[PDB]
Enzyme design. Structure first.
Site: not given
Ligand SMILES: Nc1nc2c(ncn2[C@@H]2O[C@H](COP(=O)(O)OP(=O)(O)OP(=O)(O)O)[C@@H](O)[C@H]2O)c(=O)[nH]1
Ligand SMILES: [Mg+2]
Ligand SMILES: Nc1nc2c(ncn2[C@@H]2O[C@H](COP(=O)(O)OP(=O)(O)OP(=O)(O)O)[C@@H](O)[C@H]2O)c(=O)[nH]1
Ligand SMILES: Nc1nc2c(ncn2[C@@H]2O[C@H](COP(=O)(O)OP(=O)(O)O)[C@@H](O)[C@H]2O)c(=O)[nH]1
Ligand SMILES: [Mg+2]
Lengths: 427, 426, 38, 75, 46, 436
Positions: A10, A61, A134-135, A169, A196, A218, A244
């Site tokens: 995500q 997802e 994890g993803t 988070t 973050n 973002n 470079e």
């Molecule tokens: N910059 C940014 N960081 C994000 C965002 N959403 C989640 N994160 C970061 O992603 C970290 C952990 O990853 P997840 O939130 O689990 O997202 P993911 O790794 O794709 O996990 P899944 O839900 O399985 O897809 C968190 O500590 C957040 O700091 C976002 O929209 N923008």
């Molecule tokens: Mg995610």
């Protein structure tokens, strides 16, 4: 001259969601893909008057990608480049890597292959993910290995949203991050970390935002990537390409983790008043308050830095500012780098993105450095991993998925060896 | 794509589920008749997780009522929003368990379980991708404790890779209504610790205290208790039906919360709960929501979390919000109350955001804690069980119906080590 | 006993997936012959 | 060429394996693949050893399962 | 059986993968020596 | 240079109903046998010679013989949207059904309708001036397509003989199937088809279902969907005679450069690009990737992996504006491609036909308007596996004499059962001896 963008998870998909809406308006291409050759590095002309981005969005997802399918750029992307799994990885490295990953990573590779076939002069890949979940961790550590064993010789710029110490988070980040950083150490080539908490602090101070959501973040990273790739999309008096950058910076094979910075990160009300010029924008980029990873540049000696100047900048004031920053004793370069700067310039001003508070400015500096200051980052994340792993907490999910108990130890020792390498090269 | 099938056991489960469907159907915009008449498309966009299209815009829920009496089902049908249900799902006997675990688990359970698994199989085959089941029941009855336990065990012997959200209304002493609650509660938790994967503890004592203190109601019937429980149950699982900035589904919540392979007993809250007089004199800021969310007189459990540490916690916010604000709020909470958090887990708290709040409430949140205070309810039921069982009071009703004495003692031992693991980790 | 059997079957499936993914990662043994010959 | 190249039924069998490997190495001076295929054959021999070890452990586990079930039935 | 297959694969891929580095060093150094051969030829020209 | 068409069986007549619509759309003929009054012509007054014939006043009639026994689909056509187009007499409908029975299709009912269709065939041929060949369209898994089709093939070979025949026949899939007694009909018709039809083109129901599932993005396709792309394939095959081709191949090039041995004529078919509107304008259609998708094993109308065999020879018909340099480079890339392997005794084995007519679009269809398309007909040796698997299915049925009484109640003995068996065995041996 081409780099293809792969977004995983995500965080990566949404960062690309901001990044592509930035590029489309920067090039003049409408949402549904039409003008009213600089786009060739990112957009490919298909049919007549239609442009398609060289990107693939991928996640397990489905709803996160359905957001893109139902948004305003539904016509833009190839209707298949928006991959979707069936069940989420559930922030489980083992589940994302082994159990679910197999069915979809082969599809991802078979699409990357045809993207590369459509391309001719590829520089390489730019991938987006976060090593906290994890993803984006398991799928990243599998897909990167797949690409490094198939294409092998390409450069994979990995822009990873590394997890912050205090703000966090998730709860299994100390495991997921080490499991990802085993592979990320020795399969990619340049890994630009982002934090973050650090970008939150930047938003709080420079942009006076006290409720910084993910959208503004973002947009900020999107601007950084645009400044990185402007040297290839456009022309400048003093330019820089992937080779470079990537052979200038990386000193040893196993030391490549950039620190990113941007300027002028200034809202409209302050940007209309406060004056701007190279000799103070460069120092502003170097200031710790405006560095995008929760790290302390003062503690670690700088090894090699790279500067990029979008907008009207003559190549002399950059030289003067490099002098006037190297003359300051607060920041210490590494002893063996008599010259530690690589400067590049452009002729295009940053394009103000409607829907944001970012200013429309004459010039801007993007800084990417390589310095030993990041040792404490790895040390502290490994410390909290030790905290969690002392009592074998949360190991049961991974064990049931299939991962044994010894690969955690081998990855922990790999991180320890990484820290030893940083200390040795600091010496 | 993800699927949830909802099962209601006993009278308590049937009423709670009926109110839950009354709530979630509105949150999806469909009227009691079954024909959508709402406003937007974000509702319809992912209602396949609960409903099935029947014939041209007639949506039927994926729920199975089940008990041992026809009167409860007649009441459910006579009530509002009861039409939507498929009449085929209405499975029932005629005799009645009669608050007897032996009837609800050995005779009537055996004679109805084969029939009920047929309909649950039908629902679990009509779908495409299951992620877990929901069960609503009590722990102080025959049709709810024993029969629900048998049903979940029969499910586990069939779908060994799925979760169940078992919402268990624990029998509280000060709100006890039957003479033998512990003889059911102990023997139900025996297998709840073995098979079910997310047991959500609830108690009429805490629900009544919440209604008296916060809501300032004058005549709280079961309607409002079911309303609160349904609001919690609908809020826990909006991460599927609605798109959020940070999405976290059931497996993610389970893996984040449960640190050890048997500590799945969650204590739950919900915000914001207000009286309709003070709802005009308050500010629904994120810090205010977090403070009410951690207000110990708001968790739906009689065990005050001040009596132990927090193994971990999770928050599910609803409504357009600031993720940094969420994270800094939870960080401030953890730093201020660091003495209540396990030392061998850094950042004991998880946060998630969904971009759609429950309708009316422009912003809301839900709390799921795994605090070690849960041992209080179990010791407080074990005391009663031992006190009765010392002289085999009311025991012939089960022994004559087929249970030896050693089973009760083994249940005692399992309950004791369950309540001892929390003490060990505290 | 059926519970234990189902758990073991799930473990077997997990190991199956692990083996297949390791195969896909490595290959995408016939390389050592040409490696030595070169 | 060299005496005592390395520096106990398993060890004796290893000695015979080493002598056979030297014999085939001298025998064959693609032709090289026929040495590689014998490397594969020795790998299959390792596979047989793994099979035997797993057979012993699994037989012991089966006996243990029979014991537990018998005690359960008796009780 | 699956465990034995995984063990076989990890062993056979750990043995799959430095003397060639030194041998190619010799190759390149001798390429330098034959640039010196060309130097000898140009000395003959002189 | 006219080509006549024969459609036998319900499958054949349905394919014809879905294909003559494509022809009448390509040549701008209104669906009642006339041209529009206004000049809406792509060009030429004889691009429609191969299929129609003006009669006094713009009343064209197709050169089609729609022969079927049971009259439920023939009269469906008769009352469909094509009434003033078809010839009332060509549409031959018998009296009763064939009922999956080669016996009833070939001896009992066939004998009293073959001599009735033959006179119409003779009249059409005599009317024709430069007759080119026959195109047969049938189903071996049924009664009329297999039985009546084989009888008509034999009784046209006995008469005309020298003329070429192109037989588009469908087979049952390895797993997906509808008829129960289809192996018997398949083998019995295969024996007749072996030594009479000049060039056999193969189709498979599941092999088109899965393409319509993976490419056209339809999870519930049907016969009315398969027949449209079957018509597309035959149009790609026949466009060379019709339209001005820079490098064009008449009907006899298929037999001249793709049948190295008279016994060996069994050919896989592929067609690119199978794309819909959603992804059509997002993808780029180029002679490299369309050809690559043609030669990938996931886009063949015959469910069979070409990996198990060696491509003996191939023909590639290109439509639309294609410049020969790119196709020459593409076939060079194919020759450098590793997976597909050739028998070493054929150094040149790519015929590259090209035309100047882009592919057509039918309203309400799935495929979109595109620049160029390619049809790949390959004489490979993987089809022996198809025949062998069908035979292994047949053996189990024949061992227990099942369904045999239904067959033998008519003129069919068991001698022809055994001879069809041994004919398939001889075909297996021939294909395997070709081998390396
Ligand atoms: N910059 C940014 N960081 C994000 C965002 N959403 C989640 N994160 C970061 O992603 C970290 C952990 O990853 P997840 O939130 O689990 O997202 P993911 O790794 O794709 O996990 P899944 O839900 O399985 O897809 C968190 O500590 C957040 O700091 C976002 O929209 N923008
Ligand atoms: Mg995610
Ligand atoms: N692709 C495709 N196949 C068809 C169609 N119609 C029939 N078939 C095939 O035809 C096979 C059976 O043959 P029939 O359709 O009965 O044709 P037939 O030889 O006339 O048999 P009878 O009608 O009994 O005389 C089936 O297995 C189908 O695969 C069609 O419209 N499209
Ligand atoms: N929330 C709620 N709880 C109820 C209601 N009716 C009964 N209960 C509780 O459920 C328990 C009885 O469980 P019951 O449904 O009768 O189980 P059964 O005896 O097997 O049918 C009592 O302790 C009550 O406190 C209701 O309408 N709402
Ligand atoms: Mg028929």
């Amino acid at each position: 001259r081409e780099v293809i963008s792969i977004h995983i998870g995500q965080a990566g998909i949404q960062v690309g969601n901001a990044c592509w809406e930035l590029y489309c308006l920067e090039h003049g291409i409408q949402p549904d893909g039409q003008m009213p050759d600089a786009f060739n590095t990112f957009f490919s002309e298909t049919g007549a008057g239609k442009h398609v981005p060289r990107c693939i969005f991928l996640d397990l997802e489905p709803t996160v990608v359905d957001e893109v399918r139902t948004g305003t750029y539904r016509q833009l992307f190839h209707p298949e480049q928006l991959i979707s799994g069936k069940e989420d990885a559930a922030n489980n490295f083992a589940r994302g890597h082994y159990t679910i990953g197999k069915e979809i990573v082969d599809l991802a590779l078979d699409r990357i292959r045809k993207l590369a076939d459509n391309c001719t002069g590829l520089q390489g890949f730019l991938v987006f993910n976060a090593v906290g979940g994890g993803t984006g961790s398991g799928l990243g550590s599998l897909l990167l290995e797949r690409l490094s064993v198939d294409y092998g010789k390409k450069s994979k710029l990995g822009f990873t949203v590394y997890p912050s110490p205090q703000v966090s988070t998730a709860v299994v980040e100390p495991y997921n991050s080490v499991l990802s950083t085993h592979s990320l150490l020795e399969h990619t080539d340049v890994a630009v970390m982002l934090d973050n908490e650090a970008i939150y602090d930047i938003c709080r101070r420079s942009l006076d935002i006290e409720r910084p959501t993910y959208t503004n973040l973002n947009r900020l990273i999107a601007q950084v990537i645009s400044s990185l790739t402007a040297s290839l999309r456009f022309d400048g008096a003093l330019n820089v390409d992937i080779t470079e950058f990537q052979t200038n910076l990386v000193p040893y094979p196993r030391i490549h983790f950039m620190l990113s910075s941007y300027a002028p990160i200034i809202s409209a009300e302050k940007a209309y008043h406060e004056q701007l010029s190279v000799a103070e924008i460069t120092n502003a980029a170097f200031e710790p308050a405006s560095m995008m990873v929760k790290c302390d540049p003062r503690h670690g000696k700088y090894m090699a830095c790279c500067l990029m100047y979008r907008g009207d900048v003559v190549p002399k004031d950059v030289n003067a500012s490099v002098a006037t920053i190297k003359t300051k004793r607060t920041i210490q370069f590494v002893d063996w780098c008599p010259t530690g700067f690589k400067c590049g310039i452009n002729y295009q001003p940053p394009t103000v993105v409607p829907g944001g508070d970012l200013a429309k400015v004459q010039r801007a500096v993007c800084m990417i450095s390589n310095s030993t200051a990041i040792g404490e980052i790895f040390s502290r994340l490994d410390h909290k991993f030790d905290l969690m792993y002392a009592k074998r907490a949360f190991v049961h999910w991974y064990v049931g998925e299939g991962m044994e108990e010894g690969e955690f130890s081998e990855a922990r020792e790999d991180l320890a060896a990484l820290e030893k390498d940083f200390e040795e090269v600091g010496a | 794509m993800r699927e949830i099938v909802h099962i209601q056991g006993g009278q308590c489960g049937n009423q709670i589920g009926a109110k839950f469907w009354e709530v979630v159907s509105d949150e999806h915009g469909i009227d009691p008749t079954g024909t959508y008449h709402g406003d937007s498309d974000l509702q319809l966009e992912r209602i396949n997780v609960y409903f099935n299209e029947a014939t041209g815009g007639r949506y039927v829920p994926r729920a199975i009522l089940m008990d041992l009496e026809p009167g409860t089902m007649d009441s459910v049908r006579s009530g509002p929003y009861g039409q939507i249900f498929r009449p085929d799902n209405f499975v029932f006997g005629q005799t009645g368990a009669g608050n007897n675990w032996a009837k609800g688990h050995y005779t009537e359970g055996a004679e109805l379980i084969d029939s009920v698994l047929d309909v649950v199989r039908k629902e679990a085959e009509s779908c495409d991708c299951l992620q877990g089941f929901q069960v609503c029941h009590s722990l102080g009855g025959g049709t709810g404790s024993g029969m629900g336990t048998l049903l979940i065990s029969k499910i586990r012997e069939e779908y060994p890779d799925r979760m169940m959200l078992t919402f268990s209304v624990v029998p509280s002493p000060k709100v006890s209504d039957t003479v033998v609650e512990p003889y059911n509660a102990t023997l139900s938790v025996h297998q709840l610790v073995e098979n079910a994967d997310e047991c959500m503890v609830l108690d009429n004592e805490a629900l009544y205290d919440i209604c008296f203190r916060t809501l300032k109601l004058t005549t709280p019937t079961f309607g409002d208790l079911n309303h609160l429980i349904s609001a919690v149950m609908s809020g826990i699982t909006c991460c599927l039906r609605f798109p959020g900035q940070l999405n976290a589904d059931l497996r993610k919540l389970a893996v984040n919360l449960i640190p050890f392979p048997r500590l799945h007993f969650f204590m739950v809250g919900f915000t914001p709960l207000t009286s309709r007089g003070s709802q005009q004199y308050r500010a629904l800021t994120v810090p205010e929501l977090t403070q009410q969310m951690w207000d110990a007189k708001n968790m739906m459990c009689a065990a005050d979390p001040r009596h132990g540490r927090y193994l971990t916690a999770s928050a599910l916010f609803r409504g357009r919000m600031s993720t940094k604000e969420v994270d800094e709020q939870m960080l401030n909470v953890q730093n201020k109350n660091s003495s209540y958090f396990v030392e061998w887990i850094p950042n004991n708290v998880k946060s998630s955001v969904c971009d759609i709040p429950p309708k009316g409430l422009k912003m809301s949140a839900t709390f799921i804690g795994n605090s070690t205070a849960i041992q209080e309810m179990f010791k407080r039921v074990s005391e009663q069980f031992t006190a009765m069982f010392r002289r085999k009071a009311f025991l012939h009703w089960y022994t004559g119906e087929g249970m030896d004495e050693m089973e009760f003692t083994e249940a005692e031992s399992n309950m004791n080590d369950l309540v001892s693991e929390y003490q060990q980790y505290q | 006993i059926t519970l234990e059997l189902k758990e073991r079957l799930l473990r077997c499936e997990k190991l199956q997936a692990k083996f297949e993914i390791i195969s896909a990662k490595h290959r995408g043994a016939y390389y050592v012959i040409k490696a030595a010959q070169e | 060429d060299v005496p005592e190249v390395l520096q106990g039924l398993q060890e004796v069998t290893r000695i015979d394996k080493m002598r056979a490997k030297r014999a085939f190495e001298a025998s064959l001076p693609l032709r090289q693949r026929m040495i590689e295929e014998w490397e594969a054959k020795e790998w299959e021999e390792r596979e047989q050893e793994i099979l035997s070890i797993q057979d012993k452990r699994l037989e012991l586990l089966d006996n243990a399962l029979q014991v537990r079930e018998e005690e359960l039935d008796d009780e | 059986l699956w465990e034995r297959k995984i063990q076989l694969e990890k062993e056979m891929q750990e043995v799959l993968d430095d003397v060639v580095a030194e041998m190619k060093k010799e190759i390149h150094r001798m390429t330098l020596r034959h640039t010196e051969l060309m130097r000898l030829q140009e000395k003959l020209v002189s």
